[PDB]
């Protein structure tokens, strides 16, 4: 098992921050990062605390939304120090912080999400989390941690929901053009949320909305990734 490290590609005028999935890592962003590099963009893909290790409990005990927001915020500052223009996207988790960045942080040209937010009552993550852990724990040569997981997961999911609900309430503050990408066969989050996000962005200069009809959740990595890359690049060029 290799620990995915944060990584960076140099560009010239325009940089892009990509914030990864919950239980994910910078690997979520490998195809997209490279696609943006091929179009001359700078890219930075940080690692959220607790993530990227052989031990699933690290996510639950070493990371939390406030840490991940600080890290998201620092990653944006890293790029807005260097490039004339900066874009910020993320998956579901990463996308909460990307939208909070558009709402609350200076110097961002545009941004958006590659999947719907994690909001109360609108997700089936517990089964997924436990399945992710089992794979990691098999891979590792380690025994089931379901019990310890269950003692923490609901607490953390509620932490994320709470963080997300505050971000959702402030979507009126977004002025930037905003990208919305959603998988059509998503079992982890309720894709209808993407339609609600579009509608909540009442002051966004524009909303570039895409649906990936036969794709599962992680559209940056699965069958939809070529289309996604094309649409995100076109969106960036449009600005």
Helix content: 40-55%
The tally of domains stands at 1
Could you tell me the number of beta strands? 7
The CATH C-level class name: Alpha Beta
Radius of gyration from the CA trace? 17 Å
PDB class: hydrolase
Keywords: alpha beta hydrolase, rotation
Assembly: monomeric
Entry title: Snapshots of esterase D from lactobacillus rhamnosus: Insights into a rotation driven catalytic mechanism
Describe this structure in words.
It is a single chain. This protein has 239 residues and is an alpha/beta fold. It has a single domain, classed as 3-Layer(aba) Sandwich (Rossmann fold), CATH 3.40.50. The protein is built from eight helices and seven strands; from the N terminus they run E-E-H-E-H-H-E-H-E-H-H-E-H-E-H. The protein has a seven-stranded mixed β-sheet, sandwiched between helices. The longest helix has 24 residues.
Short key terms for the protein model shown above:
alpha/beta; 239 residues; Rossmann fold
Describe the structure concisely.
The PDB classes it as hydrolase. Keywords: alpha beta hydrolase, catalytic triad, rotation, esterase, hydrolase. The chain is an alpha/beta fold and 239 residues long.
Blueprint (SSEs and pairs):
Blueprint: E1 7-9, E2 14-19, H1 30-38, E3 42-45, H2 57-62, H3 65-80, E4 85-90, H4 92-104, E5 110-113, H5 125-140, H6 146-169, E6 178-183, H7 193-200, E7 207-212, H8 225-238
Parallel strand pairs: 2-3, 2-4, 4-5, 5-6, 6-7
Antiparallel strand pairs: 1-3
Helix pairs in contact: 1-8, 3-4, 4-6, 5-6
């Amino acid at each position: 098992f290799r620990k995915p490290q944060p990584f960076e590609y140099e560009g010239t005028d325009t940089g892009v921050v990509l914030l990864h999935a919950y239980t994910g890592s910078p690997n979520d962003m490998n195809f997209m990062a490279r696609a943006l590099q091929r179009s001359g963009y700078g890219v930075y893909v940080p690692l959220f605390s607790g993530h990227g290790t052989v031990e699933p409990l690290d996510i639950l005990t070493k990371g939390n939304p406030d840490i991940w927001w600080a890290e998201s915020s620092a990653a944006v500052a890293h790029m807005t120090a260097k490039y004339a223009k900066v874009f910020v996207f993320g998956l579901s988790l990463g996308g909460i912080f990307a939208m909070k960045a558009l709402e609350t942080l200076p110097g961002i040209t545009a941004g958006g999400v590659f999947s719907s937010p994690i909001l109360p009552g609108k997700h089936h993550l517990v089964p997924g989390f436990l399945k992710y852990a089992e794979y990691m724990n098999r891979l590792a040569g380690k025994s089931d941690e379901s019990t310890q997981i269950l003692a923490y997961l609901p607490g953390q999911l509620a932490a994320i929901d709470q963080f997300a609900t505050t971000v959702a309430a402030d979507l009126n503050l977004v002025k930037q053009p905003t990208f919305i990408g959603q998988a059509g066969q998503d079992e982890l989050v309720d894709g209808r949320l993407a339609y609600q996000l579009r509608d909540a962005l009442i002051n966004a200069a524009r909303v570039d909305f895409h649906w990936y009809d036969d794709a599962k959740h992680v559209i940056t990595v699965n069958s939809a990734h070529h289309a996604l890359e094309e649409d995100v690049i076109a969106f960036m060029q449009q600005e």
